[PDB]
Write a protein that binds this ligand. Sequence first.
Ligand SMILES: Nc1ncnc2c1ncn2[C@@H]1O[C@H](COP(=O)(O)OP(=O)(O)O)[C@@H](O)[C@H]1O
Ligand SMILES: Nc1ncnc2c1ncn2[C@@H]1O[C@H](COP(=O)(O)OP(=O)(O)O)[C@@H](O)[C@H]1O
Ligand SMILES: Nc1ncnc2c1ncn2[C@@H]1O[C@H](COP(=O)(O)OP(=O)(O)O)[C@@H](O)[C@H]1O
Ligand SMILES: [Mg+2]
Lengths: 266, 266
Amino acid sequence: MDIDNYRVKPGKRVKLSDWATNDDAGLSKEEGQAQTAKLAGELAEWQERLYAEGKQSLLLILQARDAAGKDGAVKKVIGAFNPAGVQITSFKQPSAEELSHDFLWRIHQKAPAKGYVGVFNRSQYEDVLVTRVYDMIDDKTAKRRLEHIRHFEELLTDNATRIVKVYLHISPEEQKERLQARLDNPGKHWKFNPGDLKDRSNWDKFNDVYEDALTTSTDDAPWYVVPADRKWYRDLVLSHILLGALKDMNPQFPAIDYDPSKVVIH
Amino acid sequence: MDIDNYRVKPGKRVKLSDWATNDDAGLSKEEGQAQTAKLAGELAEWQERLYAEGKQSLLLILQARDAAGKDGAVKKVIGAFNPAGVQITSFKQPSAEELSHDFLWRIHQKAPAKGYVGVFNRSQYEDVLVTRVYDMIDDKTAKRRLEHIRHFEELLTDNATRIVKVYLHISPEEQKERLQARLDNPGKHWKFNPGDLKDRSNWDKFNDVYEDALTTSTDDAPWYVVPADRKWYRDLVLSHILLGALKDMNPQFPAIDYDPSKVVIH
Ligand SMILES: Nc1ncnc2c1ncn2[C@@H]1O[C@H](COP(=O)(O)OP(=O)(O)O)[C@@H](O)[C@H]1O
Ligand SMILES: Nc1ncnc2c1ncn2[C@@H]1O[C@H](COP(=O)(O)OP(=O)(O)O)[C@@H](O)[C@H]1O
Ligand SMILES: Nc1ncnc2c1ncn2[C@@H]1O[C@H](COP(=O)(O)OP(=O)(O)O)[C@@H](O)[C@H]1O
Ligand SMILES: [Mg+2]
């Protein structure tokens, strides 16, 4: 398994048809889940070092279609961290106050603080995705917003915020099964709504706007196209993406301002 | 077991000395850890239902002395929840802007939203604890603030926010062991500073002000004194306290207003 094959290389436009949705790296469901469990412990040790150092931060931007596994990726992978060093934000339709500001106003407010892991379940890229498919903005506006997004991610990069953008990539047939599954199991009826089917009818339009958004992939702010047909594999790759980022950040425990040898606890 | 022995009953004044610090309910560390692990799954099932329903909220208020187990209780017990349905806040020294407002301003801002679990690592009670030991306020101010806190907790209770306040109860000699360990292990020097020792020298003054604070215990907003000398036991009791609240709240999955069988996913 080379995780870098899933990284959108800088400057190269992408075709979603050229990326697989159901890779498994020649691993069984058990070998993957077992390895994902071992990585869960590794993720925790490094998230503790990140919080102790208090100099850097990690920002995961999760973008995907309905039933792709955003909720499951957070519950399984992000659940490995100490929840006190994590901040999760699920961006839904902008409120009235949010619309009275530029489109990055509400986004910037949730940027992670030093020492924290930040997650955007849906993010600023919504403003150049669903907003385009349904003609809330035109191509001119969309293009400029993408330039504004790059600069925003460049701002946070110089602030020591390591950016990682992940797109969970599934096939239409896999989505069909998962949507039918929510309709068949009484316990999950609440996760399905008459409107997940509208975005489905515009599947090919979302391909175009998603491929546009992926052009923001740089060395400092990379995109990853993660085959997500297999949920265990989705979790396994994301485990590798986040831990590999954490290890490259190499957070060191903080210095002390006292002499331990000379302290007398009364 | 009986968790109700650890609940400060309404209207009755208490002395912390009346509670043991190293209870175990006749369980070994292993049988306890096993029980804590078995309950983690139930906490998760009910936290998902609470978030799915979106009508109620759970507020945990954590108060405890140095090396008593605030961070460890959160990492172990609160770590059972999906971090997307949780909000943790560690209240430190008030900032300048926070001091320019009433003492509950920064607290109220962090009240949990419907469907969420909220945790306060240190809380509004700091304003009637450390503020008194070091003569930042007088007895008259402290007494009135305690009334304002009860009203505040009554406000959130009528909002369907289930309040639960926990005090982790350890002995001085256990604190001495835990602090000396950080001075002895180089890997833990960063968790200690010669300032953790100031509150320790005023242990008996904190007894008085903590015992005053416990009088806000009501049927709706109870306090709990949890013997915390044994770290595995702290985690076991807190799991029971929080799961008992979630089960008593009894959050229900939301009903649907459509017929899944006649939905046609093209
Ligand atoms: N900036 C934005 N402008 C318009 N719509 C947005 C924006 N950001 C998010 N949304 C929309 O909010 C909705 C949130 O859906 P959500 O309830 O999270 O779906 P599910 O829970 O089924 O995954 C999405 O349909 C998304 O397109
Ligand atoms: N010296 C140590 N040995 C073993 N575990 C430790 C040590 N120091 C801290 N821990 C871990 O940290 C937790 C204690 O949390 P702590 O930081 O004392 O909370 P508080 O904020 O009240 O000081 C323990 O449950 C344990 O998991
Ligand atoms: N409302 C408040 N007024 C005055 N001091 C406060 C208040 N809330 C918290 N503090 C103080 O802030 C300090 C935070 O200590 P620190 O060790 O940095 O936090 P923690 O141990 O919780 O990680 C504590 O000594 C506490 O007394
Ligand atoms: Mg939905």
